[PDB]
Structures are given as structure tokens and as C-alpha cells.
Amino acid sequence: MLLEPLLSGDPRMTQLAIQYQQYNGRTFNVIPEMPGSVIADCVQLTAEV
Amino acid sequence: ARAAFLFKTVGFGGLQNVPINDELSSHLLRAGNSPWQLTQFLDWISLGRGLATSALVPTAGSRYYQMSCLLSGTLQIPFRPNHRWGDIRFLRLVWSAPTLDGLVVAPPQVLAQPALQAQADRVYDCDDYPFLARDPRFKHRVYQQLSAVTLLNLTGFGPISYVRVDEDMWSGDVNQLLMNYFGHTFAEIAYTLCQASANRPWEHDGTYARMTQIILSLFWLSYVGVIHQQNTYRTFYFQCNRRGDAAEVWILSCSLNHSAQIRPGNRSLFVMPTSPDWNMDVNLILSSTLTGCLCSGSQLPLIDNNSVPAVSRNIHGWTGRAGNQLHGFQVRRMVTEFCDRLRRDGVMTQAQQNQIEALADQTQQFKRDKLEAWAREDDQYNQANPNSTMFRTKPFTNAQWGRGNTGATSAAIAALI
Amino acid sequence: SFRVALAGWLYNGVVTTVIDDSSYPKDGGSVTSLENLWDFFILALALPLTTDPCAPVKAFMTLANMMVGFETIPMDNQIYTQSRRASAFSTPHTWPRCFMNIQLISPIDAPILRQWAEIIHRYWPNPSQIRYGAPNVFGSANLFTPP
Amino acid sequence: YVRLDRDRVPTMVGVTRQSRDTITQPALSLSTTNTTVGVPLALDARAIT
Amino acid sequence: LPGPDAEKWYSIMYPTRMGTPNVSKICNFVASCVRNRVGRFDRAQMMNGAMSEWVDVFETSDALTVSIRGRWMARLARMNINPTEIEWALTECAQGYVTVTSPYAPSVNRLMPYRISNAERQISQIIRIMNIGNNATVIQPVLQDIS
Amino acid sequence: EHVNVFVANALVGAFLSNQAFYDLLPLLIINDTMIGDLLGTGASLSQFFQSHGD
Amino acid sequence: VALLSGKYPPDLVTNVWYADAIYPMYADTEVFSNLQRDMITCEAVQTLV
Amino acid sequence: EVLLLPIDHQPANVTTPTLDFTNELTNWRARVCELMKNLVDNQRYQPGW
């Protein structure tokens, strides 16, 4: 596997995040701080060229 | 816990008789023969999934009005001091029985004699009519409707709605029930609540009575933009993909992203559209209708006399001396209040707003040209047929089209949280 | 069942363990049947090891069920009775008012159930935490909890 | 794990694909269609006791 | 559309899709139509990886039969009830002896038409009575059944 | 102490007719509401009183 | 004879007995179906008039 | 919701029944017997048996 799960419906996404709710309605949202990406940047670099 | 059951009939738009004639009544009773048209209304209107129109009934708001007139007329018969029910007609119509279960054509000997001379802006107390006072259930089922009527007849504007916020309402059973509605439209929901209400009239602080109240707030709090997918009320919020469009469709949905912190306490207020373009907004209407069902068993706060026309003041169960005020608004303008708000929270772009506002404009333009045009058609008729004067739609004035308080009430609602 | 029960403590966010409905007393059970009393025992003794956030309520209601006709607790709903099978209280919205406020159970109308209630509140296990792994070199995929 | 603290009992876990600054079609993760917080697994009271 | 020999429909379905090279009476029409009103118009996607609950879409059809079906759906939509309502209902009838359950979580919209007005029930209960009055051999088997 | 008339009456009334009466005593003294007290109970005969919710 | 010779099973326990006896009866959704009929019966009538 | 009955219904408070004669119809049997017994011991009927 690798990305398969993300390809199950409108993969036109922006960012992953996960959360859970309590009976009283309050919820906790965890949004990991995505760092850089060599692959991503390189693609763009070459695209710039 | 309501104890006074009064309602108010409609007034003539400067006419000599109730704004409805035979041709129009026959059209209402076409498929059903009862004057309590809730059910039959909900069918025509068609889940407000497209602009509904007819020859005699051009808009939903028209049928709503007409339905009101028919009751305002016929009901004046059994509510006469003597309480006789089948001795006189009202335009060829007479009651089927003491229990007001339907109208039918008058017997020849009754058609022969004159009709009842109905009056305008009358206020009656159900408990004055035996058959209503003796069978509580019957009363409560029917009142549900007389209320929706009253809520339309108090002012020359649109149907009044009641918005309340109170964390104490949210109980176990409520939470359990609500979750089922995930995915249904405002209409789709209202439709059922109405039916469920008619079968087993709600109690004061009942499970349904509360949830229905909660739904209303959820709708409004979202209609104005205080709540949304990124700032929910206990994860709930109503969604609309085409805000502005002629026929809006709101969906109840979920979101765990955030749940706005709510202030403890109980807060409520009354809202009502003031612009004529309500005759073409199924949600704004049903919203009233629901607050209508609420009234059968619950006593809402009184409405400050100063917010309503003289004729409808000091009505024991409705208008009072030091009550809450009515908050009116123009449909178009609110649309912007809606956008502005979201854009400030950072969930909508300026471009998106423009795209919406633009449409919202085109929509108003259409709805107005039509309403005014049909309005004219009516007068044209009334001059040619002075004996059967009527109105396919509640009368409105050029002034009604302005903003006025729209913004003021836009914040009033936002204050409920 | 024992071992898995433990393994479950680790993936409590995607999997929720519970006691098979079959382990409850047939037809609700009754404090008059010797066999049932044993069912109750076996049950109460094992519930605490399940991740099911409603274990307690079920552990309570079970006896409340068998008690029908001897002791009576008050129901907040005019629909659900004291016979609502226990294995049905699966979510939080079903926790009966008299379960959260023991004070509502009459020591006269239901002396035993009252104790069973106090025992649950006063003695049901208390969660806790423990350090694990080496977060400075391997990092940590914890999401809702500290690394 | 919260014992008798009802209000704080978790009931739903979901994942999100779009960013917090956008309003999209709500597409709840399948993870949320579970009555419990997660997939139900049944154990045998007897054995455990 | 389903079924084979479908490529034909895609042209009767959307007229705004044709090309307009000619000055033919047809092309002229097509050519004068708004471009953007074809195909899917709006949808209600609730579950990631499930069907859309419903979709609005432009395509050939006739306002009349569309309205008819519109009110038909409207009438059924009123008869709809949900699991919880049924749970409650059944539970109430059984007086507690039987306990059933409904799930608690986001559904996928279900159309289950069953709720009708008391009026409707009385009207048929009269029809019902009508065709039996005086003829014993019609009601007896009913009693035996209940017996 | 305040006594629960309802119970008092059933007490004497059950005893005078040789029906089980001892299970009524604990209710002789009012706890908080003369009515509320009985609304719960599953004691004595429905011949004297039964509850219908509130 | 009925009124004279009624007899309950030895160790009867109403709360249980009925819980078994009735269950199956409430697995017959014939009830709901009937509602739909009534629904039509009435549409038929009005359509006639 | 109302269901009429040609008899007095006094819900039972227990789940473990025991013979009970404090019923409406039990008295009826009693009275009927007592009557007969009187018809027999009637000073002007008893001499014939």
C-alpha cells in the first residue's frame, strides 16, 4: 500500500487531519504540520526549467 | 405550556370581502375537501425542489395565503355567538358537520338565501366553540394550523418564525433522534415533523418539541452564516451549495473540525422576512409552519404590541404589552450578510462572494418582475369582476422591497450564541 | 478472549471490544434462577477488561433487569422500561439518569440495586498511563495522546 | 479512557482531506459509520472470568 | 443511461452539446442556447466513497411528468420514518417485554414510507367494517386466529 | 413526623381485610412527596393504588 | 371448565416467560405493510369522487 | 390507545405468582355457590332430599 486509501473518492485534496468527538459535542482536531518534500520540490524545480 | 387558544383571521386588502372567491376555493379543494390544508399543501409545494407555480396559485406563498383566507371565511360561521354550523353558506360552501371535518356545496335551499358577510381582522378563542373545547386532542391538532395562520396574519409582512438557543434542551433522546436526519434537507425533515405532530400532538418540553426547536435554530444560525462546516453547533450545521439561487436547498450535515463554544442560558427571538420575495422561499415558510406546530402545546414569549399593527394587539395568547420585538429582514440583503460573515471567518473568498451576490441579484430581479406582474393581473380582474374580488397572493407595497433592519436583525441572531 | 482483550487496549481507536450478547442472561434473567445469578457473576467480573465505554452501565442494568418484580428503579423515559435488555445500552445517550445520580434510587424500593450502583461508582477500575518507546530517536505516531 | 465521566465519552473518529479554510462537500470517512468508536469485536465473558 | 445501444441517448439527452457548423434550422437553435446548463448541476455527497444521496441535473424531459413525479415523491417523503422512531414505536407496543435496537451514526438516507394520518386509518377501518356487517362467517375466522 | 394519608388508609384498609400489610409500613412516613413517594413503589395491591407515569 | 381448571406452570416468572413468548410475534412486519395499503385505499376513494 | 374491557383489570405487582382468590371473578364463583347452598338448606326445600 501507499496512497491507495486516499484514492477512494475525490483525491483533489489539500491536507490530511484526524479527529474524534465526545458525547457533549466537543471535538479534538489533530492536524499534523507537514514539512518539506524533496520529491515535490524537485518536480517543481524541473517544471520551472 | 399554552392555555389560551386564540387565532386571528386575515384582513381584506381594502376589499369589501375576504380576498377569495369560488373559482379559487374549488381549486384548493380540488383533490382534498378539507379546509385544514397542511397535508395537501405539503404535496403541491413539492419538497421545494424547484419553483412551484400554477394558474390560480403562482407561488407557494400564494397558496399559503389563500389557504388562510378560506379558513378566515368559513370559520366565521361556527364562531358566531350562536355557534350554529350548517345553517348558512360562505360562497356556496357549508360545513360537512359540527366537527369542521370538511366543506361541501350548499344544499339548494341554502344557496337560495344570502351568504355570510364575513368581516376582517377578527380574533377568536377556540374554547368558545363547544366541539373544540370538549375534544382537546382535536383542538391541539387543528390549532397547529390556526397558529401557522395567525403567524402569517399578524403583520402585513411574511410568516413569523421563532428562534431559540438553549443548551439545556439537548438531552439524551434528542441527541439520539437528531442523528437520523443527517443528510436530509430542511424540507424533507419538516415534512415528517409535521405529520408526526398531527398524529400525536407534542407536549410542553417533549422530545419532538425540543428537537424541532433545535432544528429551527440550526437552520437560522446557518442561514445567517454564524455556523458552518468550520464552526459548528455540536458538529451540526445546515449546508447550502447554491446560496442565492431561486430555489435553495439546505442539507443538515456534520463536521468534527470545530464546535463553537456556546454561552449557557436561554435566549430566543422572532424573525420574519419583510420582502415580498418570500412567497417564493419554501424554507422561510416551512420554518414558520414548524414554529406553528410548536404553539399547540407550548406558550411562546409574547410579541410587543409596538411591533404589530393596531388591529392585532393585546391578543391574549400572542401579542402583549411588554414583549419581544419582531426582527424583519430583506431576503436579498441577508444573502450578503451571510457572505460577509463567512468571508470574515476566512472560509469564503472574495471571488466566491461576488459569484454569489451576482446570482442573488439575478434571482431577486426575476422574483420581483413576476410578483409585481401577477399583482397587476389581479387588479385587472378585480375591476372587471367586482362581485368576486380576490387576491392570488398576499398584497405588498413598493416599500416592502427595501432593506430596513436586515442588518440589525442579522446581528441579533448572531447574538444567540 | 483474554489475550485479545489486552491486545485491544492498544487499538482502542479503530476497534472496540465488548461482551458477546450471548453472555448475558437468557430472556433477561431473574434473580430467582440460580443459573442466572452465576451469569451475572461471570459477566460483572469480566466487563472491566473490555474497551467498551459503556461497560459500567451494562454491568448495572444487567442486575436491574433480573430484579424486575422485586426491586424497582425509576426510568427517565416514558418509553424504555426497567426491562430494556442490558446489552442494548451501547451508546452514552442511553445512560439512565438514576445511574449518574445514585441519590435517585430508593434504598426502600430497591435496596440491592442501590448498593450495586454505589459499588460501581466507588470501585470500578481507574484508568492510567505508562511511558513507552524511545521518542527521541524513533519519534512517535501517537495522535490524540502525548508522544 | 474515561470511566463514568459521560460527557467525555468518545463516539466518533473521522479523517479530513480539505483544509480548515475551505467549505467543501462533507464527505465523512467510513470510519464514522460505526455505532461505537470503532469496529465491534465480541469477546467471551466466560473465558475472561 | 443503463442498457446497451446507449450512445444514442447522449445526443437526445443534451442538445447544447451538438456542434454548430451549419446554418440549419437546428444548428441555429442549438447555437443560441446558453452553454453552461448541461450535465450534473449539483449534488449531496455525504459519505466519502458511497453514492451521492441525490443529484440535480439538466437533461431532456417534460415539465409535466416531472412535476407529477415531483409531488409523488413529495407524498412519500411525508410517510418516511427512521429507525429510532420505529425502535420507540415497537418498544412502546410490546409494553417492555421485547426490546429492539436502532443504530447511532451517520446513515445513507433511507426512504421508508409507512406513516399515515389517523384520518386515513379511520377511513379504511370503516371500509373494512362495511364489507362484513351481518355476515358472521367473515369475522369468525378472524377471532379464531387471535384465539 | 408527617404521615402519608394514602398509605395510612391502605394500611388500615388492608389489615382490616386480612391482606398483606407489612410491606406498607416503610412508606407510612412521608419521604418528600405524599404522591411522589408512591409513584415508584411496587408494593402492596393495585387494588389500593397503581401508577401511570406521573 | 376453563374458569374452573386454570393452572400456571410450576416455576413461572412472568417477566421472563413473556419475553420469550412474544419476541417472535414482533418479527412480523406485516403490520407496516398494511399501512401502505390503507394509504392507497384512501387515494383510490378521492380519485373516484 | 384506549382498549375497553368487560372486566376489572388490576395489574399484578409481582413476577412470581401464587394462588390468589382476591379476584373479581373468584367472588362471583363464591357467591354463586353460596346461593345454591342456601337454596338447598331452604327450610321448605331441604325436606325433599
Answer for the pair C109, C71: CB distance below 8 angstroms, yes or no: yes
Separation CA B407–CA B399 (nearest Å): 17
Contacts of B81 (CB under 8 A, 6+ apart): none
Separation CA B58–CA B40 (nearest Å): 16
CB-CB under 8 Å, C74 with F27:
no
| Longest CA–CA separation in chain B, Å | 71
Q: How far is H24 from chain G (nearest CA, A)?
A: 12
CB-CB under 8 Å, E114 with G35:
yes
Instruction: Verify that B206 and B346 share a domain, yes or no.
Output: no
Query: Is any Cβ of chain D less than 8 angstroms from the Cβ of E1?
Result: no
Among B283, B316, B285, B323, CA closest to B301: B323
Instruction: Verify that B113 and B176 share a domain, yes or no.
Output: yes
Answer for the pair B238, B217: CB distance below 8 angstroms, yes or no: no
Separation CA B187–CA C36 (nearest Å): 50
Answer for the pair B158, B287: CB distance below 8 angstroms, yes or no: no
Beta strands B319-320 and B303-304 are parallel
Answer for the pair E41, E47: CB distance below 8 angstroms, yes or no: no
Residue of C nearest to H12 (CA): C69
- Residues in A closer than 8 angstroms to B234, CB to CB, are 24-25
**Helices B60-74 and B282-297: angle between axes, nearest 10 degrees:** 40
Query: Which of C75, C81, C94 to mutate to test binding with chain E, by most E CBs within 10 Å of its CB?
Result: C81
H47: which 3 cell numbers?
325436606
**Encoded amino acid at B40, one letter:** Q
**Encoded amino acid at B25, one letter:** S
Residue C144: CB atoms within 10 A of its CB come to 12
| Residue C103, SS3 per DSSP | helix
Instruction: Verify that B230 and B346 share a domain, yes or no.
Output: no
CB-CB under 8 Å, D9 with A14:
no
Among B292, B328, B344, B342, CA closest to B147: B292
C126 burial via Cβ count (<10 Å: 0-12, 13-18, 19+): exposed
B289: which 3 cell numbers?
409552519
Separation CA F9–CA C33 (nearest Å): 36
CA angle D29, D31, D36 (to 5 degrees): 140
Instruction: Verify that B357 and B412 share a domain, yes or no.
Output: no
| Residue E61, SS3 per DSSP | coil
**Helices B406-414 and B331-345: angle between axes, nearest 10 degrees:** 50
**Encoded amino acid at E55, one letter:** V
F25-40: string of b/e by CB count within 10 Å (b at 16+)? eebeebeeeeeebbeb
Separation CA B159–CA B286 (nearest Å): 9
Q: What subunits touch chain G, counting only 3 or more CB pairs under 8 A?
A: C, E, H
Q: How many domains does chain B have?
A: 2
Separation CA B74–CA B92 (nearest Å): 11
Separation CA E100–CA E83 (nearest Å): 10
Residue of A nearest to C13 (CA): A20
Separation CA B43–CA B31 (nearest Å): 11
Separation CA B212–CA B233 (nearest Å): 15
- Least CB-CB distance to D28: which of B228, B230, B254? B254
| Residue B86, SS3 per DSSP | coil
- Residues in D closer than 8 angstroms to A23, CB to CB, are 6-9, 11
Instruction: Verify that B347 and B250 share a domain, yes or no.
Output: no
Separation CA B160–CA C139 (nearest Å): 59
Answer for the pair B105, B93: CB distance below 8 angstroms, yes or no: yes
Separation CA B7–CA B290 (nearest Å): 16
Instruction: Verify that B260 and B399 share a domain, yes or no.
Output: yes
Instruction: Verify that B229 and B297 share a domain, yes or no.
Output: yes
Answer for the pair B391, B65: CB distance below 8 angstroms, yes or no: yes
Among E48, B138, C69, CA closest to A10: E48
Separation CA B192–CA B200 (nearest Å): 12
Beta strands in B229-321 (DSSP E): 236-240, 250-254, 266-273, 303-304, 319-320
Contacts of H42 (CB under 8 A, 6+ apart): none
Please report the resolution in angstroms: 3.6
Separation CA G14–CA F51 (nearest Å): 19
- Least CB-CB distance to C32: which of G13, G19, G20? G13
What is the residue whose three cell numbers read 345553517?
B87
Q: How far is CA B40 from the centre of its chain?
A: 15
Judge B/E contact: 3 or more CB pairs < 8 A.
yes
Instruction: Give how far Cα B246 sits from Cα of B287, B332, E36, Å.
Output: 17, 11, 17
CA angle G24, G29, G30 (to 5 degrees): 110
Separation CA B244–CA B228 (nearest Å): 16
Instruction: Verify that B209 and B354 share a domain, yes or no.
Output: no
| Residue F30, SS3 per DSSP | coil
Answer for the pair E84, E51: CB distance below 8 angstroms, yes or no: no
Among D13, A31, A26, C135, CA closest to C146: C135
What is the residue whose three cell numbers read 370559520?
B75
CB-CB under 8 Å, E43 with D27:
no
Contacts of C113 (CB under 8 A, 6+ apart): C60, C63, C64, C67, C71, C73, C105
3-state secondary structure E75-131: HHHHHECCHHHHHHHHHHHCCCCCCCCCCCCCCCCCCCECCCCHHHHHHHHHHHHHC
| Longest CA–CA separation in chain D, Å | 51
Instruction: Give how far Cα F7 sits from Cα of B321, C107, D11, F22, F24, Å.
Output: 48, 18, 46, 11, 7
Pick left, alpha or beta for residue D19 (phi over 0 → left; psi -120 to 50 → alpha; otherwise beta). beta
What is the residue whose three cell numbers read 496512497?
A3
Contacts of E65 (CB under 8 A, 6+ apart): none
In sequence order, the β-bridge partners of residue E56 are: E42
Nearest 5°: phi and psi at F3? -100, 150
The method recorded for this entry reads X-ray
Instruction: Verify that B352 and B211 share a domain, yes or no.
Output: no
Separation CA C57–CA C38 (nearest Å): 19
Answer for the pair D43, C21: CB distance below 8 angstroms, yes or no: no
Overall residue count recorded for chain C in this entry: 147
Among B248, B247, B228, CA closest to B239: B228
E118: which 3 cell numbers?
389517523
Q: How far is CA B112 from the centre of its chain?
A: 37
Residue of C nearest to A17 (CA): C143
Instruction: Give how far Cα G34 sits from Cα of B39, B128, B208, E83, E124, Å.
Output: 21, 39, 26, 18, 11
Query: Is any Cβ of chain B less than 8 angstroms from the Cβ of C1?
Result: no
Instruction: Verify that B349 and B324 share a domain, yes or no.
Output: no
Residue A28: CB atoms within 10 A of its CB come to 13
Q: DSSP secondary-structure letter at B325?
A: P
Separation CA B116–CA B126 (nearest Å): 20
Instruction: Verify that B314 and B230 share a domain, yes or no.
Output: yes
Separation CA B68–CA B195 (nearest Å): 19
Contacts of B23 (CB under 8 A, 6+ apart): B56, B388
Separation CA G28–CA B408 (nearest Å): 57
Query: Which of A16, A19, A23 to mutate to test binding with chain C, by most C CBs within 10 Å of its CB?
Result: A23
Separation CA C53–CA C60 (nearest Å): 13
Among B92, B81, B77, CA closest to B20: B92
CB-CB under 8 Å, D9 with A15:
no
Beta strands B266-273 and B6-8 are unpaired
D3: which 3 cell numbers?
470511566
Beta strands B6-8 and B123-125 are antiparallel
Separation CA B170–CA B234 (nearest Å): 10
Torsion of CA B371, B372, B375, B379, to 10 degrees: -170
Answer for the pair B66, B287: CB distance below 8 angstroms, yes or no: no
DSSP string, C21-66: GGGSPGGG--TT-HHHHHHHHHHHHHGGGS--TTHHHHHHHHHHHH
Radius of gyration of chain E, Cα coordinates, nearest whole angstrom: 26
Q: DSSP secondary-structure letter at B301?
A: P
What is the residue whose three cell numbers read 390507545?
H1
Separation CA E34–CA E14 (nearest Å): 12
| Structural domain range at position B381 | 330-387
Instruction: Verify that B289 and B183 share a domain, yes or no.
Output: yes
Answer for the pair D45, C19: CB distance below 8 angstroms, yes or no: yes
E87-119: string of b/e by CB count within 10 Å (b at 16+)? bbbbbeebebbbbbbbbbbbbebeeebbbbbeb
Radius of gyration of chain B, Cα coordinates, nearest whole angstrom: 21
CATH number at residue B336: 1.10.287.1520
Beta strands in B255-341 (DSSP E): 266-273, 303-304, 319-320, 326-329
H9-46: string of b/e by CB count within 10 Å (b at 16+)? eeeeeebeeeeeeeeeeeeeeeeeeeeeeeeeeeeeee
**Encoded amino acid at B73, one letter:** G
Answer for the pair D8, C100: CB distance below 8 angstroms, yes or no: no
- Residues in F closer than 8 angstroms to C72, CB to CB, are 40-42
